[PDB]
Design a binder for these strands. Sequence first.
DNA 1: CGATAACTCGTATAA
DNA 2: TGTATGCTATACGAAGTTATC
DNA 3: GGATAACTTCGTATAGCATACATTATACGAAGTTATC
DNA 4: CGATAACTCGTATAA
DNA 5: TGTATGCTATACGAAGTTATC
DNA 6: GGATAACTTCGTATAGCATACATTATACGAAGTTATC
Lengths: 321, 322, 322, 332
Amino acid sequence: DEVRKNLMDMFRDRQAFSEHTWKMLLSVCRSWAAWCKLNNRKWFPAEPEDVRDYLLYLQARGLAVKTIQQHLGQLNMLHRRSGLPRPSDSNAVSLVMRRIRKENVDAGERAKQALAFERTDFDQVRSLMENSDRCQDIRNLAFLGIAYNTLLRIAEIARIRVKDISRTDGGRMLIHIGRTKTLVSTAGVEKALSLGVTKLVERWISVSGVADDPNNYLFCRVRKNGVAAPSATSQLSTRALEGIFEATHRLIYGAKDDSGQRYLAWSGHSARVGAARDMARAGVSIPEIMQAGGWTNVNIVMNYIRNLDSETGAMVRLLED
Amino acid sequence: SDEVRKNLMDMFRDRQAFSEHTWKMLLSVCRSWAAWCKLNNRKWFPAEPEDVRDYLLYLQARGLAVKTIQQHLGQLNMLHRRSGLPRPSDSNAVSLVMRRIRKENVDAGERAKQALAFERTDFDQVRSLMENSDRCQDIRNLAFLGIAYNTLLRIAEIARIRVKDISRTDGGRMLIHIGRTKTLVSTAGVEKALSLGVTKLVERWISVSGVADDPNNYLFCRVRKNGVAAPSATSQLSTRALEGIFEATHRLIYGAKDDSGQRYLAWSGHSARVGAARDMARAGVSIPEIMQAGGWTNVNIVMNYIRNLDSETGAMVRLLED
Amino acid sequence: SDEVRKNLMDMFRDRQAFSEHTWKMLLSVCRSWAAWCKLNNRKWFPAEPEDVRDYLLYLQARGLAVKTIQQHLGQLNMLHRRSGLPRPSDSNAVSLVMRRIRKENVDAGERAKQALAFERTDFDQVRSLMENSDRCQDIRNLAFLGIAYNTLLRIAEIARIRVKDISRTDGGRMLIHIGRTKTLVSTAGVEKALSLGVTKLVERWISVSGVADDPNNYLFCRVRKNGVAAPSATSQLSTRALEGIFEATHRLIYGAKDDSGQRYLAWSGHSARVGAARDMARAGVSIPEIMQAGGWTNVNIVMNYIRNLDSETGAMVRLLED
Amino acid sequence: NLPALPVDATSDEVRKNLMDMFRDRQAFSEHTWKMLLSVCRSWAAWCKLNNRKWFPAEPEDVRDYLLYLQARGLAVKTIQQHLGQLNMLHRRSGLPRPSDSNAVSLVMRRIRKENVDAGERAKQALAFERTDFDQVRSLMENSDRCQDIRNLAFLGIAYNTLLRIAEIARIRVKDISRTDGGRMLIHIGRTKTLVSTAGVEKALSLGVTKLVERWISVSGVADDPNNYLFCRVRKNGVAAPSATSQLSTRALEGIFEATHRLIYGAKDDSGQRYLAWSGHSARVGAARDMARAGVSIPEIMQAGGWTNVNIVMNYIRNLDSETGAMVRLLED
DNA sequence: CGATAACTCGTATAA
DNA sequence: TGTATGCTATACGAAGTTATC
DNA sequence: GGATAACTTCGTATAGCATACATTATACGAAGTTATC
DNA sequence: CGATAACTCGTATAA
DNA sequence: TGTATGCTATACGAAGTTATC
DNA sequence: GGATAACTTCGTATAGCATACATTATACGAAGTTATC
Ligand SMILES: [Mg+2]
Ligand SMILES: [Mg+2]
Ligand SMILES: [Mg+2]
Ligand SMILES: [Mg+2]
Ligand SMILES: [Mg+2]
Ligand SMILES: [Mg+2]
Ligand SMILES: [Mg+2]
């Protein structure tokens, strides 16, 4: 009755979230309704007893703990934004989730992260791709240069556009990073390419002709002939950028298994992780690293370098003296 | 209600349990919320969720900073919760519109600013430039800048330092005792220590000013056109003046600031804080160590205060270039 | 009641959301309680304050330790609150008698016992004394004592290690991965690294027993009279066995466990932890580094893991005599 | 015991409860009771004088009382103690507690601020560091007076073991053993906690052992292993052992006071605390001495049974060893 | 075979 | 096993005691 | 009888810790259980 | 007696 | 000014698309 | 004409990360104030 109004307002300001959240909200509501109408359950308002059976179902489907959490999570957001009791506030639900988390991690489940794209990998890739002339092997080598030199997220590298680019009297470029994705942007408001990586990006800037219009997105599509098609309305999808990583990896280690494992070949974050791991080996303080990446937590970074010989622990040092 | 008017009378009676700055803003936001509330014919208390949303949006329209708007929504909340009534933010209507506004304005290209850094670089310069002066005004300001930079203490905190709060370590280094800060209010205090270099800068300001006359005198005070420091133990230099010492010292090495009307065009009160914060990060100081220096309890803030190097920058750039 | 029967039911339902030992101990206590309850003609649920008190007083009577008594009171409380009823400890009479019984036992003489240390010194010995042996189990045990001291992991944790949870650093050090410990259950888990010397003791037992023929094999498995391994992926080595290894290795050097009935008369499950905790203390390791090594997140547990140097002790004595 | 829970004011089960509390009275430290009773007396008297019902306490009155204590110029830690004891009374008797109401909570917060802004700061014991022990020694080691020998052995042990005066008064002959090294080792049974974070035995250096051994063979406390290590010494300089009466901790504090009087003279005329050594003086000084000799925080804390770093840090805060990161950067 | 090396329970107590 | 904060020590001036000058 | 060193007892004022809460592990002697010898 | 150096207050925004 | 947990964004196989080959 | 190269577009499965909550402080131009030159 009243909830209906809440829902209308919930929608009136749908702008209060990312299209990416709404994707999952809907994506899960779907899965919920689906499961309900097949078991005879009112998908809304959801009854704790039902949700439980549901969550317990996703576990049987093989989904990871993090996913079951997103499902339960979106289910909540839906109910909270309607003056309604969220299923997590029910003693049955929170009780099974604790059951599941333990059951799964205990069963051996485990969280993974991107495959590192370290320095050694930038040099190898710079070698075979360096002397190429193709209007693509150029673009790609410059995207990789930026990925590892600014640890920027792919979605950020996409939005970059010539205007943003400028230069330092040192003879190195400086990508202005306007339009952040946070009020208090933990990373800089300016990322600066090295010397080499500057040259490499320039090469692409000429051969592409994106230079013309400044509102043009630095990176763009490149058809089967070898001609870039600059634009200022559409940006090179994140999916494409991921591919650029995927491809380069394949060009050196063949194809992925028949297996279904994730992170078998480089991906969007592969730069960041590698970047992190290198600064570590170098001796950069955690505060310097955390910022160079725009990280706020400190565990996430320790996660990427948890297997270096430098972070082995005090007991080891003690035993070898 | 009976309890409502009782919860409020309780708060007003002991209004001194809150910062005077909290009162100043509670009142400012109120009159502002009342004004609009009248010239729109709406009840200003208890606030109706749908009316607050309108007001918040009216503020977005006015072109006010995300934060400034949260501050408004913030007092409104405190007023209701301290009353015992549910708060505006307890309604999806206000709850969501607030996010929408934070979301919109950020994309429209808006981000929070921070004081223009005052780093070691700048200190060494401003020092060797006034280092030799024999004017009371100069001698003072050089110490103010030394403490400001060395301790990372906020201007408010500095304004309160009294000669009796100063002691020394066995090696000669000075020690200032601080009781109340922005986030701490205990009788244990905290002891911020000076370097041998800065400790001397204060000593010179102490004698030339004659403030050790009464252990209760504040460390910093006024100095009139005649060049004579006027110590006091009941009137402290205003934080407006310390901000002045900063602006002026910057207008001295860079002269006249822009006509932009923008904020942070010249050194302000927080400048040494953010400046030092940088210098340390840049020097490899650990997270914990950078925290005791600034009085921060979690990496969260410390990290915020960093926007770091640019020119040739450092870190990655400094890594690629073999 | 009606709901209580439910809440208790749901509780039993996902009874897997809790620790195995938690349930084991719940029942055991309810048996001890019910028992005394019947023999004294008192209801057993809801447990009425006075009864719970006469009972706790009964346990103090029966000569039980403080820690043991709290466990009973604690289980009794879990049952009550988990089922929706007020806790017997919520009653001025029960919350007090508990404090009293502790106060009295401590004030008398009673103290908490700790595991008998197994420091680096003890490791070296046990090593140069088994290091050469070619026995299939003499090789396993030394690889266990290695990991225990080196990682400070708890026996139940060491018992769940699978070959697939092992990896290596470029420097060539093993780097076991733990997923569930007493203090945390997550897919993130933590990675404990072994030294070069100790990584070696493991690289051996791995071959000599070929547990490495199925990634899902538990690194440690039983050995039979004949000295032949016995890999598995459905059966972990009992923690009771691990406790055994310690005693055994203690016997091997200090003869037989004197007949005194008391506990901690010879190395046990936790000896590696306390031992390592101590050795790190002496070596001068920092708090954040020791907490990291033992999976502790607070200063007040690490300190808790110490009651240091005996005889000529250290610190103060070293200071004065120096 | 208590003031006088009224014939008609204390009504119902608040009588049941209060009765249960005195039944398990042994649930709290004797000192805790001391303070509960003192506060109640203090509040009770304030109530009479100001015509207020003392129990249950009305919030508005508790508040007038707190503003009263502040006006009497007491420290915030003390005012907190008074509200605390009051809360315990009320809670442990079934009634809702003051400080559970806006009036008291707000006033309390206000008092705290106003007082810190007035410059009120927490004081700690005057340190008794090594250089102090060495001076006291160089003087008192030549005295044959039974009292002086006792005192020097006292000081020696306080500084060496970092034990609290309540613990030193409990050491009894049979708690002393010998180390193959040839130095004493004091076992500390009857600790303070279930889990004794300070250890189970303290070792005295060789020199302090010599100091203690001289007190033993001149006091004759060996006569009965059950005798307390320390005891009285009268007008005539003759020890008086006992296995039933230990020296009051007041007396121990008296040794520190006196020893300070001997070297530095009569105490200043103000009324400030900590103007001469007290019972915690060795603990503090020792923490400092160790800090200067480069000891790990963990090792220090254990040497003194500390469990919360904040405290030892409070003791070594002014050592140049702890000036900070900004001082290092500024001093190239 | 029967004797043995080598390994599920229940209560008590520490993390 | 973490740990804020409610319980638990010490401070110390002054009054009460007991064996000695 | 007093006066007095050297305490003990008191009561209020402050400093300094240590535990309750809700589980989760370990300790260890005794039976129970397999595959060797 | 000006003219001048050197210092409350209200809205806006960072911590 | 701090932080558990609730938004946000990457991962990727697969299906549409649209200019070359 | 039909077969790609190189991408968009999806929807689901996971990783990463950053913010509401409730104050408390700084920014800074204008107007006001007081010894001094
Ligand atoms: Mg808000
Ligand atoms: Mg007392
Ligand atoms: Mg000294
Ligand atoms: Mg003396
Ligand atoms: Mg002195
Ligand atoms: Mg130190
Ligand atoms: Mg006297």
